[PDB]
Amino acid sequence: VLEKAQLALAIKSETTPTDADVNTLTVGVFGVDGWSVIYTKDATPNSDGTKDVGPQEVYAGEAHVVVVANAAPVIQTELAKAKDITDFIETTINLSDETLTKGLTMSSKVLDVTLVANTTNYIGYDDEVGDITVKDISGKEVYGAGPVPLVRDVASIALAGADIGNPENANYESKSFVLKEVFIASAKGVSSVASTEEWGTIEKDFFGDTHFGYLDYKVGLLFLTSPNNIDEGSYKKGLQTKYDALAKKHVENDPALNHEFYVYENTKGEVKSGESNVNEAYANHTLLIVKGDYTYLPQGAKESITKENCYYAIPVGEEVTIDGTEKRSKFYVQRNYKYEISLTIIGPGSEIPYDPMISTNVSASVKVEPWN
Ligand SMILES: [Cl-]
């Protein structure tokens, strides 16, 4: 026999939809002895900038609790079928669901609490454990560290700027670069919903014994595969799935500059075993690729030349500036950070997206900022 209790839970929160919206909360409560209660409710707004999930019946005892914001409808059901905390947090979410209209998927860490029988248990309603009263319903705060923080399950990638410079080599002067398009390649399109620790890794491994492969990478544009297969190259392997949200045309009125792209974690950039001609710095790490028209003046020429529709590809987070003036190598793409990429174009790009021609002719500076 198991005793009954009630649970109400408050989360910390930061009308056009925004990347901080919390529309729904899915709560998984897993007793240490094997019982589980999982439910989804609309998040109720609160005057203090927190949001609540109203009392729900659960069982008494020690339990592990995790909160997911903005789970897609089908994910809500998958989560409700979890039998244990590991299957819950390992639930696979899909990138194509991550819109400001849904709200971005976010999760808490796994909480450990003791639920008291025959009473209202609160999580997140006070900064200390103990008996409290909320709207005349007395009960007990069982977590005691303020409202439960949520961490986004996506990262934000944007091109902050793209201008010209000259190479030391100096066969020529750069004259201009006009941006036409920005897109993302090798975006992991799947992720775990939550991590055990706060802001922990939720990245899905690809290939090996997993069932994720090339179609689970997402890409903003597709290219011709015949006669010259240009949809693949040293920079990008596999037939990846097109997702229109991962490309943006640059037009004066609706710019590609500062447009944010949302992606899941990718630090491993796995390719299939046995692939040829793999540049491991690019394939299949998430890339930001720009296309535009580059104009230069050759040494001693009367006039300049414009190469139209040149590409420049960047592996996102190979080297980052973080905490203002610190540096990290191999940071790649991690959850709940904003990546601001500034490009210095120093020569003509490639006519094709996934291989260079002679030299990359681009230098990139990537700032990473925690998100909001
Ligand atoms: Cl567009």
Q: Separation of 7 CA from ligand 1 center, angstroms?
A: 45
CA of 201 to the centre of ligand 1 (A): 31
Distance 110 CA to ligand 1 centre (A): 39
Dmax (CA) of the chain: 91
Residue 76's region, left for phi above 0, alpha for psi from -120 to 50, else beta, is: alpha
Q: How far does residue 179's CA lie from ligand 1's centre (Å)?
A: 13
CB 244 within 8 A of CB 184: no
Whether 4-13+23-91+110-148 and 92-105+155-267+286-370 share one fold: the answer is yes
CA of 249 to the centre of ligand 1 (A): 4
Experimental approach: X-ray
- Taking the centre of ligand 1 as the mean of its atom positions, its distance from the CA of residue 314, in whole angstroms, is 20
Q: Give me ligand 1 centre to Cα 48, in Å.
A: 38
Residues 231, 222: Cα–Cα separation, whole Å = 6
In angstroms, the CA 221 to CA 92 distance is 24
Calpha distance 22→366 (Å, rounded): 29
The span from the CA of 171 to the CA of 265, in Å, is 40
How many angstroms does the Cα of residue 159 sit away from the middle of ligand 1?
14
- The residues pairing with 181 across neighbouring beta strands, listed in sequence order, are 249, 291
Alpha carbon of 250 to ligand 1 centroid (Å) = 7
CATH architecture of 92-105+155-267+286-370: Sandwich (2.60)
Size (the chain), residues: 372
> 3-class secondary structure for the chain?
CCCEEEEEEEEECCCCCCCCCCCEEEEEEEECCCCEEEEEEECEECCCCEEEEEEEEEECEEEEEEEEECCCHHHHHHHHCCCCHHHHHCCEEEHHHCCCCCCCCEECCCEEEEECCCCEEEECCCCCCEEEEECCEEEEECCCCCCECCEECCEEEEEEEEEECCCCCCCEEEEEEEEEEEEEECEECEEECCCCCCCCCCECCCCCCCCCCHHHEEECCCCCCCCCCCCCECCECCCCEECHHHEEECECCECCCCCCEEECCECCCCCCCCCCCCCCCCCCCCEEEEEEEEEEEECCCCCCEEEEEEEEEEECCCEEEECCCEEEECCCECCCEEEEEEEEECCCCECCCCCCECECCEEEEEEEEECC
- Count how many Cα atoms sit within 13 Å of the Cα of residue 230 in the half-sphere of its side chain: 13
CA of 96 to the centre of ligand 1 (A): 17
User: 25: CA distance to ligand 1 center in Å?
Assistant: 32
Nearest to 219 by CA among 252, 249, 188, 265: 188
Neighbouring C-beta atoms of residue 46, cutoff 10 Å: 14
Integer-rounded Cα Rg, in Å, for the chain is 24
The alpha carbon of 9 and the centre of ligand 1 are apart by a number of angstroms equal to 40
Q: Where along the chain do its domains lie?
A: 4-13+23-91+110-148, 92-105+155-267+286-370
Cis peptide leading into 255, omega within 30 of 0? no
Measured in Å, residue 102 CA sits from the centre of ligand 1 at 21
Query: Considering the domain 4-13+23-91+110-148 in this protein, what is its CATH number?
Result: 2.60.40.3160
User: Tokens 């860490």 — which residue?
Assistant: 109
- Cα dist from 329 to 130, 271, 317, 342, whole Å: 45, 20, 7, 17
Distance of CA 173 to the CA centre of its chain: 38
Contact 283, 236 (CB under 8 A): yes
Distance 180 CA to ligand 1 centre (A): 10
